[PDB]
Structure formats: C-alpha cells, structure tokens
Amino acid sequence: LKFPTTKEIQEAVAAIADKFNQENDLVDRFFPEDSTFASELELYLLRTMTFVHQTWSPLAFKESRVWDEKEILYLGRLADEVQAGVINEQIAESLTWLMARMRNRRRWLTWQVMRTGRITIQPNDPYNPNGLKYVIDYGVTDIELPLPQKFDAKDGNGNSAVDPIQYFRDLIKAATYFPDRRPVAIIVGPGFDEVLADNTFVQKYVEYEKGWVVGQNTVQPPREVYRQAALDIFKRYTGLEVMVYDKTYRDQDGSVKYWIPVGELIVLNQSTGPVGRFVYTAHVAGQRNGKVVYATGPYLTVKDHLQDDPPYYAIIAGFHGLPQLSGYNTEDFSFHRFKWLKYAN
Amino acid sequence: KFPTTKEIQEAVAAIADKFNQENDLVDRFFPEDSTFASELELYLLRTQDAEQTGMTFVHQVGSTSLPVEARVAKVDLAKATWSPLAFKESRVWDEKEILYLGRLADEVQAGVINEQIAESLTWLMARMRNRRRWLTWQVMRTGRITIQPNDPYNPNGLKYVIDYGVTDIELPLPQKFDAKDGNGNSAVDPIQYFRDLIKAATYFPDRRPVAIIVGPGFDEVLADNTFVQKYVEYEKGWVVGQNTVQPPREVYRQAALDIFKRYTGLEVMVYDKTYRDQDGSVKYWIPVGELIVLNQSTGPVGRFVYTAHVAGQRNGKVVYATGPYLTVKDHLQDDPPYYAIIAGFHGLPQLSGYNTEDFSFHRFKWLKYANNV
Amino acid sequence: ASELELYLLRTQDAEQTGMTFVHQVGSTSLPVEARVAKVDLAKATWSPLAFKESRVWD
Helix, strand or coil, X not given: CCCCCXXXXXXXXXXXXXXXXXXXXXXXXXXXCCECCCCCCCCCCECCCCCCCCCCCCCCCCEEEEECHHHHHHHHHHCCCCHHHHHHHHHHHHHHHHHHHHHHXXXXXXXXXXXXXXXXXXXXXXXXXXXXXXXXXXXXXXXXXXXXXXXXXXXXXXXXXXXXXXXHHHHHHHCCCCCCCXXXXXXXXXXXXXXXXXXXXXXXXXXXXXXXXXXXXXXXXXXXHHHHHHHHHHXXXXXXXXXXXXXXXXXXXXCCCCCCCCXXXXXXXXXXXXXXXXXXXXXXXXXXXXXXXXCCCCCCEEECCCCCCCCCEEEEECCEEEEECXXXXXXXXXXXXXXXXXXCC | CCCCHHHHHHHHHHHHHHHHHCCCHHHHHCCEEECCCXXXXXXXXXXXXXXCCCCCCCXXXXXXXXXXXXXXXXHCCCCCCCCCCCECCEEEEEHHHHHHHHHHCCCCCXXXXXXXXXXXXXXXXXXXXXXXXXXXXXXXXXXXXXXXXXXXXXXXXXXXXXXXXXXCXXXXXXXXXXXXXXXXXXXXXXXXXXXXXXXXCCCCCCCCCCEEEECCCCHHHXXXXXXXXXXXXXXXXXXXXXXXXXXXXXXHHHHHHHHHHHHHCCEEEECCCCEXXXXXXXXXXXXXXXXXXXXCCCCCCCEEEEECCCCCCCCCCXXXXXXXXXXXXXXXXXXXXXXXXXXXXEEEEECCEECCCCCCCCCEEEECCCCCC | CCCCCCCCCCCCCCCXXXXXXXXCCCCXXXXXXXXXXXXXXXXXXXXXXXXXXXXXXX
C-alpha cells in the first residue's frame, strides 16, 4: 500500500523546517526570510520627520529528486501490512535530504552574494542540469577594502609587516567624523589568527603589559598561545566584535567549503543586524478548479506515478525565490555596508 | 485565466484576413491548394497549343486511315520523385510572465492577455507567410531547393535537395552591364540585349522575354550605361556636345526605367521585400544586381499545395484538416513550467504544367552582373 | 497602468521574418524559438509624468 498522508506530509514538512530553523546561523540572520505576493522583478531596493505643528528579474529554484518507483512498489507490495509505517520512514529521510539541500541552496545564495557581491551561474555546475546564466549587480560603494600591504609578510625571526590594530586605529581616527565608516563588527568563519600570532609588534605590546620583555625576562612569545589569545588581544586593542560562523557544502566536488572565505575577514561598518533580504516570491501551483492563488510559503506536495505506464516516483517542494540587497541610500545611489580586505596570497 | 477557443480561432482568422488583404506578387503566382495526398508530384503537366499544332492527313479516297502518331502521352509516361517538407512551429511562454500577468491583470485578465494572444498569432502568421515566400522565391531564383544548417532557421541540418530539372535556370552574360571602357562607357545596351533575346526567340515560342522582376535598385547601373544615357539624351533632345555639357545622374535615373519599359516592352515589376533570419541584416529575396525574367507569358505559374494534416486522428476512421490549423497546449499542471500554443501546416509549392512533349520547361531565367557596390 | 514603459520593444515587422523552423516529420518534436521574441530583459527606466492644472478668477 503506497498511501501517504497529506496533512501528515505538511506536519512532517513543518517538523523538518523546525529542525532546519533550529540550526540558526549568522548569514541566515543577515539575509532573512520574507514572502511577498508581488515580485515585479525588483531586487536592488532603496530603504533608509514628525513635524512639530501649531533592477533584475527574479532568480528562482525548486527541488525534486527521483527514486526508483519499481523498488518502491517492490518494497510496498512485499511488506504489505506494515507498509505505511515502513514507507513513512523513507518519506522522512527523503524530506530530510530535501530540506538539507534546500537550506544549502538558500544559504549558498546568501554566502555567494556576500563574499563575492554578485551572482552569476554557469552551465558547468553539476548542482543543476542546465545552468542558464543570469547576472545581478551590487549597488555598493566599495565591494572590498583597500590595503597598504599584505599581512602575512615576514621580517626577521617572526614578525608581520603591517599592524591591523594600528590600521583599524587609523580607521577609527578617520571615521570619528563619519561613524558610518567605522567598522562595528568583523566576521571570520575559518581560521584567521595565524597572522595575528605572527605580529611580534602585537606580542611585544602584550608583553609590555605583561612585563616580561622579549629580550629580558622571556625568550620567545609562542604563537600557539596567540592562535587563541589574539582575539581577546585584538578586541582589547581596537575595540570591535569578532564572530565565528562556518558550515559545510554538499556538491559534486565533496570539498567542504567554508562560507566565509578562508584567511582574510568580512567587515560591516554602517550598522548591525540584517543586511539585505532573501525574498521568497510566488510559486506556480494548480490554478484551481476555481481561480488563481500564489503560494506564500515554500509549497510542498507529493507526486504519484502509479497510474502512468512510464513510472517514476518522486516528490517536489516547489517554490520560487529572489535575492534582495541592502536598502540603498536616499543621498547617493551606491550604499556601502559590507567590505573585506584580502591577504590570501 | 484564458480566453475562448472559438474566439481565438475567429481572431486568428481576422489576423489572416488582415494579412491576406495585403497581396503580393508571389501570392498571385502560387495560390493555395490542398490535398489529402502526400506523394508530392514534382511537376504538373499541361501542354496543348499552336506550337504543339499538328494537322490532319492527306488521305486518298476509299483506303484505310493513316492513324495518329501518339508521341505525346507516350512520352509523358514518367514517375516523379519528391517529398513534402512540412513546416510546423509552436511558441511557448515562461511561467514567470504567466504569473506576472496573472498578478498584473487581476482586474481585467481578459484584454491584457488577449492582446498578447493577438500579437503572438499575427507574428506567427507572418513567419509562416515568409517561410512560404522563402520556399517559392528560393526555388524561382535557383531552380532547385537546397537546405543546410548554416541558414539560421536550421539548427538541425535536416537537409533535402529538391531539384525540378529546369533546363537553363540562368543566362550567360559575357560581362556585366556597367563595364567601363574608353574613359568610361557601357559594355552593353540592355535593351538591345533583350531584343537579341527576342531575335533568338523569333522561331521559338517560349524564349521571348515577356515580363521581368527585380527586387532592389538596378537603375543606377542603367544610368551608368552610356547606351541608356544616349537614349535619354535623344529623348529630351539634348546633346552633350552641343546642347548640354553635363546633365545630372538623376535625370538619367528618373528617365532610365521609363525609357527601358517603353523601348523593351516587358513589364518591370519591383517586389523587394523583407527578411532577416536572426542576423539583423534584413535582406531582399532577390539579391542586388541580378534579375529574374519571364519569357513564356505573364500569369499564374505553379501551384502551392497543402499536404495533409498529421494529428491525433480520432476514435475511428480518419480524416485530416485541409488548411493551416491551430490548437492550444495548457501545461499549468505539469512539472516543466510553461504555456504554449501551436499552429503549423504541411505543404509544398508545385511548379506549373510541364511541356508534355519534352522534359524541357523554362518559363523563367535570371542573369548575374552585380560586380561592384 | 502607469507602467513607466518608456522604450517599447516590439519588433513586430515583416523585416524580422526569420523563417518557420525546418523539422523532420515523424521524428521527435522541436518547438520554435520564443527567445526570438525575448528571453530575459531588465525593467523599464521611466518616471511617468503628469499634467494637472486649474483655472481661477476672483
């Protein structure tokens, strides 16, 4: 008996989405969920006095994985009486892998639109069959930061060239007049402290406080300490937050890709909280027996091909999406909120 | 969220009526006809004239009649090897614009979709008509039909070389018209050239150039011909030695086609029309320079034939449609997101009645001289 | 609708004829190109303006 329950499918989709939103994350909180009824091909948006009296198209994606329906009716005709409970487990595992690659897709869109700014897709991706390309602009003043010189440059026994404490101090001085240019929080998912451990300017400044001079009392400040002390040291010196968030990536390559770039950093300066938006847009569904309706959540339903002489059993959680950038300024058209320097040589 | 089907058929008939209200040369030459057959006989046959005259017999009294030589239908016994090339097409719409118009036309879903319906129907009718024009003009300008994937309606390469055995589809020009000699003069009087064609056709019934077709301007080539220049000089009574010194080029251009049509007696017709095949360069069916003559008559040559409609037949014994059709395809439920309509035809234009006497048949020929632009 | 649809893009001409799609009958289908009309184009850039004006006499 291949009978699956539809309200129970909605409840299991609710449980799977509860598990998906259970694993919460920073980049999810930057570009959050939103569901409108009108797309109108509007992606790059603009958003930013109680008087005393007397440019894109919507980029969409849906998911469906096929299985062997002959294997399915094989097992469902063999295990006859406990068919429903045995098959609902496979329904659960199917919805698990479904929601897994779906959340990987949405979160993929978010970290791709952050660390690179733009979104262009290729036919060469094995994630998708066809891969027809579509490009989306950015609208930011500076997509990335300038550098005087790189950070993993060595001189002597162990020393890094430029001090990011002194450089962000100079940014504090230059942004005292304009507090929108002062970096509020820095974002680093994978490892970033091997260069701050190289800074014997900074290790020397720490042992100035600690009173063991590198030539007088101690011999060599061990960089393995500074690999997990440099966060507290850099925060004590400059005075901004450090947040560490990193995930895996399921693709044909199998290489676990961090979503923050390895090495350098990610910087916000203007504000704190959600930058931009993910926009759920409308799903095409059944028109109706009556009249039209647009889906307001990622719609999910089942497909049986028992009736069809070419058989294939699958399921689809069909919906359509849209990425939204940050609310642009009403003073200039380029709107800077995120930036990042680059020393990944 | 869809218009009516009989209203869509009436609207497509209205668009076809607006299309056919605009006539054409090539619509006059090859009017439509329909067959349930598909054998695609490459030639019709009709030949019985005074150039096929014959006469009765000198027979004596009281003897047996000397009978008729029956060479006509005996030589007419042959079989044709050709196959119809059916031309069918179907637009489609992305589901994004379907939902876009379902949202944007929440107040009036009828008209804002019916305008797109009329646009798609009329543009598809125009593409069909220009495909038929391509077929007819392409066979009339070369004698044969050839296909390759280089031509941008053919991504596939489904190529079918169809020839019709016209004897000399083209005409020898020893050189072009406007070959410059002396300082600069003409190589050949075109009118004296056409009267040489008549002079060769003094004994021949179907070599005598009756009417002529040309797409673009060749009149500047006429003005470069010092023969036509001297004709216009004698026409207005001017003398380049004595009366005038230099008339313009544009007196010559103005008087050239007039003096040509008056002296040669063949009707010059101009039917340059328009096609680009996704290349931007909208071209004329006849290229520049070279021109197509007719030497049999002026009248209908050939026949456009509708090949029978292949379709989902019915429950029982079948019958096919007899002209261009239309049907819609709704995929609002299906997994690939689209909507589509389809309206094709199955057909082929056929040539005229061949001569039943011999295999030779040539109502039209063409000569090439476009050596400089 | 005040569509702000400034530049109309309607190549509805006999100049843009193309041809019908040559296809082998009996074989599997191949539709005609709807991208010859349009595939993907951005939004229209206009500020759709307005005329309103009022007469007056004392």
